Design an enzyme around this catalytic site. Structure first.
Site, mmCIF file in Angstrom:
data_model
loop_
_atom_site.group_PDB
_atom_site.id
_atom_site.type_symbol
_atom_site.label_atom_id
_atom_site.label_comp_id
_atom_site.label_asym_id
_atom_site.label_seq_id
_atom_site.Cartn_x
_atom_site.Cartn_y
_atom_site.Cartn_z
ATOM 1 N N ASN A 68 0.999 -1.249 -0.095
ATOM 2 C CA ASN A 68 -0.112 0.057 0.105
ATOM 3 C C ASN A 68 0.753 1.179 0.186
ATOM 4 O OD1 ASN A 68 -1.609 2.151 0.350
ATOM 5 N ND2 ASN A 68 -2.863 1.255 1.980
ATOM 6 N N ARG A 82 -2.650 -2.291 -3.323
ATOM 7 C CA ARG A 82 -3.834 -1.563 -2.708
ATOM 8 C C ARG A 82 -3.865 -0.444 -3.913
ATOM 9 N N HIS A 95 -13.032 2.816 0.719
ATOM 10 C CA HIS A 95 -12.917 1.716 1.726
ATOM 11 C C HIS A 95 -13.583 0.569 1.200
ATOM 12 C CE1 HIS A 95 -12.732 5.082 4.948
ATOM 13 N NE2 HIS A 95 -11.577 4.390 4.958
ATOM 14 N N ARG A 143 -11.030 15.519 8.498
ATOM 15 C CA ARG A 143 -11.715 15.822 7.407
ATOM 16 C C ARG A 143 -13.002 16.281 7.834
ATOM 17 N NH1 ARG A 143 -9.839 10.381 4.626
ATOM 18 N NH2 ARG A 143 -8.328 11.374 3.089
ATOM 19 N N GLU A 164 -8.203 -5.861 5.328
ATOM 20 C CA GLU A 164 -7.883 -5.245 4.046
ATOM 21 C C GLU A 164 -6.942 -6.177 3.419
ATOM 22 O OE1 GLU A 164 -9.181 -0.887 4.536
ATOM 23 O OE2 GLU A 164 -7.673 -1.378 3.205
HETATM 24 N N1 LIG Z 1 -9.361 1.715 22.209
HETATM 25 C C1 LIG Z 1 -9.737 2.691 21.135
HETATM 26 N N2 LIG Z 1 -10.928 3.467 21.840
HETATM 27 C C2 LIG Z 1 -11.351 4.615 20.983
HETATM 28 N N3 LIG Z 1 -10.774 4.958 19.975
HETATM 29 C C3 LIG Z 1 -9.595 4.282 19.221
HETATM 30 C C4 LIG Z 1 -9.242 3.087 19.986
HETATM 31 N N4 LIG Z 1 -8.107 2.559 19.432
HETATM 32 C C5 LIG Z 1 -7.963 3.310 18.104
HETATM 33 N N5 LIG Z 1 -8.917 4.270 18.274
HETATM 34 C C6 LIG Z 1 -9.275 5.263 17.067
HETATM 35 O O1 LIG Z 1 -9.189 4.701 15.706
HETATM 36 C C7 LIG Z 1 -8.404 5.573 14.831
HETATM 37 C C8 LIG Z 1 -7.520 4.930 13.967
HETATM 38 O O2 LIG Z 1 -8.160 3.971 13.308
HETATM 39 P P1 LIG Z 1 -7.565 3.347 11.952
HETATM 40 O O3 LIG Z 1 -6.073 2.791 12.308
HETATM 41 O O4 LIG Z 1 -8.509 2.590 11.218
HETATM 42 O O5 LIG Z 1 -7.190 4.646 11.081
HETATM 43 P P2 LIG Z 1 -6.627 4.822 9.552
HETATM 44 O O6 LIG Z 1 -6.115 3.391 9.323
HETATM 45 O O7 LIG Z 1 -5.913 5.888 9.263
HETATM 46 O O8 LIG Z 1 -7.858 5.072 8.671
HETATM 47 P P3 LIG Z 1 -8.635 4.204 7.576
HETATM 48 O O9 LIG Z 1 -9.068 2.953 8.285
HETATM 49 O O10 LIG Z 1 -10.058 4.823 6.781
HETATM 50 O O11 LIG Z 1 -7.496 3.956 6.622
HETATM 51 C C9 LIG Z 1 -8.073 6.899 15.755
HETATM 52 O O12 LIG Z 1 -8.707 7.939 15.437
HETATM 53 C C10 LIG Z 1 -8.045 6.445 17.170
HETATM 54 O O13 LIG Z 1 -8.453 7.443 17.798
#
Ligand SMILES: Nc1ncnc2c1ncn2[C@@H]1O[C@H](COP(=O)(O)OP(=O)(O)OP(=O)(O)O)[C@@H](O)[C@H]1O
Ligand SMILES: Nc1ncnc2c1ncn2[C@@H]1O[C@H](COP(=O)(O)OP(=O)(O)OP(=O)(O)O)[C@@H](O)[C@H]1O
Lengths: 394, 394
Positions: B8, B83, B172, B233, B378
């Site tokens: 990715n 990806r 997504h 966003r 994914e």
């Molecule tokens: N235990 C938890 N409680 C609450 N929020 C959480 C917890 N663990 C992670 N998060 C939230 O999840 C988010 C990160 O998730 P993720 O890794 O899916 O984001 P990303 O991969 O950048 O986005 P996408 O999945 O759209 O590519 C952060 O905003 C974080 O605050």
């Protein structure tokens, strides 16, 4: 028999009605179209299109005043109601006009420079020509002020809200207010324990969620450009897409502001007409772009009706109103078919009936939610606020 | 035991995983962060942050290739999955990469210049270093191509669609596809007669309506900036409001494109953090702007979940997934409380359980609609497409 004069000052025209206080019935109506342009004119009841000839807002209301006297009802005008486009944050209800109110309307006027400055011109005019008559300001936004922050806040940085007042306001408030009230009587519902959705469908279209008599969510935003796709308005549009169009086509933000507002919507997709009756005929004669524009319109309405249902503890009624809402058997049925998920069943015998049947239920018996058409009457609602405030000591 | 390498390529980094074909389990993971800047580096399993030092995309994947050989698995890489951010209109499913595919990806690349050109750089790299290995392109948009015109058309003039390809695409897709499949097994539902809503909640957030195994509606648009409010966003924003901000603050469309994308959202309202764990703690310590940002976030999710339910004949499941969806007991419960209209009841014992409990139902028995958490994968979905296409004669 005293009367209420109702004034709606648009950018291009001045709409007016004379309603009888006794029965709330229209005695006279008219319009001063093409305002202050080279050619200006007024047509009362569409019976004699007279010629103003390059006259402004002040002279136009002076012409309407002449015809009020020509029909011997000038000395009967007990109240004057002004339709105001944008009340901002300051106006939660309808008010008796004072110097203070004018100042406050002038204050929120940057939020809608087009319509609001014309509204004030009308206030200035009516004041000059009818000084010893009580005057009322009725706002198109005031109803939507019951919205909680989570409903009106945008995802933008906090400063735009606190220093500039960027937030959802909503529109058609007077219509939404008027229709929702009638719905309580028609559906036999206790206001304080009720959940309604109101679909105002006209050349301007908006949805409102009314929980326990209060506006909790609405389709339009800071400006009338957000929400449903409309006649010439785009509705909900990806801001990323607009930025992409700007850098690609070379058009400025001003250019796109014209396109979104005056070239998009039903007119945009079909490339035929802003008017629905035309598009309904076009599709009947095998025109796909009209069929598409309608199917899209329907889809975006269904989305927001279901969307807005989220702000309710319980759903009791879906109410159709406005030009399209009241007169289109097609659009209503396509929308309800699209909302089968919410357990709606339609009565196509009842849905067939023309508007002449007034306030009517259009849902079959086994339906989970009652569907209904309620003709909107902004003029009656404005008069009612005026009459109420007419009994007040100011 | 052959393996699949998953790539990715973001604008700023290169994420990768090595999954075992036999069991679909991660053997190795990593990231090449801060790409081609003065300082560039990679950290495999977060165990030893090595230093690339100003190296580009080609050299970065060459470093990952070294470590694949250092662990004696280079000669085991049977497949490579890429990806891809934006498939445009041309890509409806995952493909085996050929010269033709590259051309076609280059064609739709104006729709996402940032991510897509980086995706191709990765394709160029992996091709160079792994030529006799079959390579697969998996698109983040392809799932959403089942959308009908009424769902993907904007209210803009028809030309922007026909000559420029301005329409809803959605994102997504791979997550939405993966989660929805699992949901059929978890909820015990016949795919061909089903209606699901999937809430992908992470730093990027989107909603998808899946009718009978098909994506019928999605929250994001042409760009990832439309729909839900997210980390940085804004989400759904009144275009009239943005035009009003431009003429008021004097900022260009480029300036606002940065604000909407990188300064708004949860970070925007709170003025504290993009991260939710911080905001959940902040509100606990009596911080209102964080409480507001969360309540707003929740409201806009509830709106789109209910909104997207319109594109279903019947609602069977609401599925939470993504970083937030999987790990936030709070957000999930606030969202379900907000959807009481749809007849949802929650099981707070079940909703309390941490992510370690994997694919789980969180709705009580009397509920009209089943609520569930399904951890998104994914990487597994990309490998599965690769493995399937691995058996194909090309
Ligand atoms: N235990 C938890 N409680 C609450 N929020 C959480 C917890 N663990 C992670 N998060 C939230 O999840 C988010 C990160 O998730 P993720 O890794 O899916 O984001 P990303 O991969 O950048 O986005 P996408 O999945 O759209 O590519 C952060 O905003 C974080 O605050
Ligand atoms: N019999 C009918 N069948 C279908 N559509 C109709 C019919 N009569 C009117 N309309 C539609 O109603 C619309 C006009 O309604 P209306 O007068 O409410 O618009 P408006 O007053 O400009 O908007 P707003 O009510 O938001 O101020 C037109 O688009 C027209 O096509």
């Amino acid at each position: 028999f005293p009367v209420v004069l109702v004034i709606n000052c648009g950018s291009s025209s001045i709409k007016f009605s004379v309603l009888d206080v006794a029965t709330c019935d229209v005695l006279m109506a008219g319009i001063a179209d093409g305002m202050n342009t080279e050619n200006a004119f007024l047509s009362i009841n569409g019976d004699k299109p007279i010629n103003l000839a390059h006259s402004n807002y002040e002279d136009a209301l002076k012409a309407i005043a002449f015809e009020l006297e020509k029909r011997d009802l000038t000395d009967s005008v007990a109240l004057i109601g002004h339709r105001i486009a944008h009340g901002g944050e300051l106006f939660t209800q309808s008010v008796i006009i004072t110097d203070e109110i004018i100042d406050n309307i002038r204050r929120v006027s940057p939020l809608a420079p087009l319509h609001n400055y014309a509204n004030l011109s009308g206030i200035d005019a009516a004041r000059h020509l009818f000084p010893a008559v009580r005057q009322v300001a009725v706002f198109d936004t005031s109803f939507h002020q019951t919205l909680a922050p989570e409903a009106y806040l945008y995802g933008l940085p906090w400063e735009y809200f606190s220093s500039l007042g960027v937030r959802r306001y909503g529109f058609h408030g007077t219509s939404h207010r008027y229709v929702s009230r009638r719905a309580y009587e028609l559906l036999d519902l206790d206001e304080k324990d009720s959940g309604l959705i109101v679909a105002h469908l006209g050349n301007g279209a908006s949805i409102c969620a009314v929980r326990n008599g209060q506006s909790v969510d609405t389709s339009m935003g800071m400006t009338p450009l957000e929400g449903l796709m409309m006649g010439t308005r785009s509705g909900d549009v990806d801001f990323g897409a607009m930025a992409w169009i700007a850098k690609e086509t070379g058009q400025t933000l001003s250019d796109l502001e014209r396109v979104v507002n005056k070239e998009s919507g039903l007119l945009g997709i079909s490339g035929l007409s802003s008017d629905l009756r035309v598009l309904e005929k076009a599709w009947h004669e095998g025109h796909e772009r009209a069929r598409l524009a309608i199917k899209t319109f329907v889809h975006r309405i269904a989305r927001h009706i279901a969307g807005h249902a989220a702000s309710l503890h319980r759903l009791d009624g879906i109410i159709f109103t406005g030009g399209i809402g009241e007169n289109s058997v097609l659009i209503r049925q396509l929308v309800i078919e699209h909302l089968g998920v919410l357990g709606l069943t339609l009565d196509v015998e009842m849905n067939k009936q023309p508007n002449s049947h007034g306030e009517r239920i259009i849902s079959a018996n086994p339906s989970q939610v009652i569907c209904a058409v309620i003709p909107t009457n902004e003029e009656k609602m404005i008069a009612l606020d005026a009459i109420h405030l007419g009994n007040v000591k100011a």
